[PDB]
Amino acid sequence: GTILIDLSPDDKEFQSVEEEMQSTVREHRDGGHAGGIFNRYNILKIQKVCNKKLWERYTHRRKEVSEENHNHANERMLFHGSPFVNAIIHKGFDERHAYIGGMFGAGIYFAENSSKSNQYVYGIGGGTGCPVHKDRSCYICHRQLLFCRVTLGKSFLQFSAMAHSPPGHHSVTGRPSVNGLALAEYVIYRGEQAYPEYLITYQIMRPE
Ligand SMILES: O=C1OCCN1c1ccc(-c2nc3ccccc3c(=O)[nH]2)cc1
Ligand SMILES: [Zn+2]
Numbered sequence: 001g002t003i004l005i006d007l008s009p010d011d012k013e014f015q016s017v018e019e020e021m022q023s024t025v026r027e028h029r030d031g032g033h034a035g036g037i038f039n040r041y042n043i044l045k046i047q048k049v050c051n052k053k054l055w056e057r058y059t060h061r062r063k064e065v066s067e068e069n070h071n072h073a074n075e076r077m078l079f080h081g082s083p084f085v086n087a088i089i090h091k092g093f094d095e096r097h098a099y100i101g102g103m104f105g106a107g108i109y110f111a112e113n114s115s116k117s118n119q120y121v122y123g124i125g126g127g128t129g130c131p132v133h134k135d136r137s138c139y140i141c142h143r144q145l146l147f148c149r150v151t152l153g154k155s156f157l158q159f160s161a162m163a164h165s166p167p168g169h170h171s172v173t174g175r176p177s178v179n180g181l182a183l184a185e186y187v188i189y190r191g192e193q194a195y196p197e198y199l200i201t202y203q204i205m206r207p208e
Pocket of ligand 2: 130131133134139141
């Protein structure tokens with residue numbers, strides 16, 4: 001049921017999604033171990049992910065959350081990196097896409113920093129890196145991230161350096177409490193609370 005529509009680089013929508021990718025790169029405390037060493041990306045393609053059934057599943061849950069939270073879905077656009085991006089865009093998010101060992105429990109994790117999601121493209125901790133060269137910092141191989149619409153609802157705030165949401169909450173927010181430059185990360189515990197809106201194909205770029 002999924003079709004992928006290419007955006008033109010001239011399209012304002014391409015440009016605004018690219019800007020969110022590039023502008024939310026940061027340095028990571030692993031010195032690039034998981035995701036590679038880079039300050040920016042080479043964006044190769046941005047595609048809109050269109051699936052009516054998955055969209056309706058998302059908006060149905062969004063309305064339920066909204067109604068439980070004074071008509072406020074608390075919807076964000078957030079990055080998700082996973083070796084399972086291809087399954088996600090066809091079948092939707094579900095329990096198989098959860099990070100069982102995540103610091104906020106077994107849920108599906110999203111980041112404000114694109115560079116954080118980039119650390120997960122080849123698996124937890126970058127796995128063994130790219131399939132072709134076994135390099136977590138590969139500058140040749142094409143990578144993919146999702147830029148997703150995510151319903152947070154009432155989000156449980158965790159200050160810090162598939163399970164259930166905390167009672168009375170629809171998500172968890174992981175607030176950075178140490179690294180002053182890090183943006184927030186978020187966890188949802190139901191696949192229906194995220195829609196994979198854009199598929200971004202890119203390379204990390206070797207700094208000069
Ligand atoms: O453990 C896994 O088995 C199935 C799939 N998976 C997985 C784990 C973590 C991530 C991931 N974890 C994050 C943690 C924090 C912030 C972003 C992310 C992010 O974009 N992705 C994605 C998928
Ligand atoms: Zn490679």
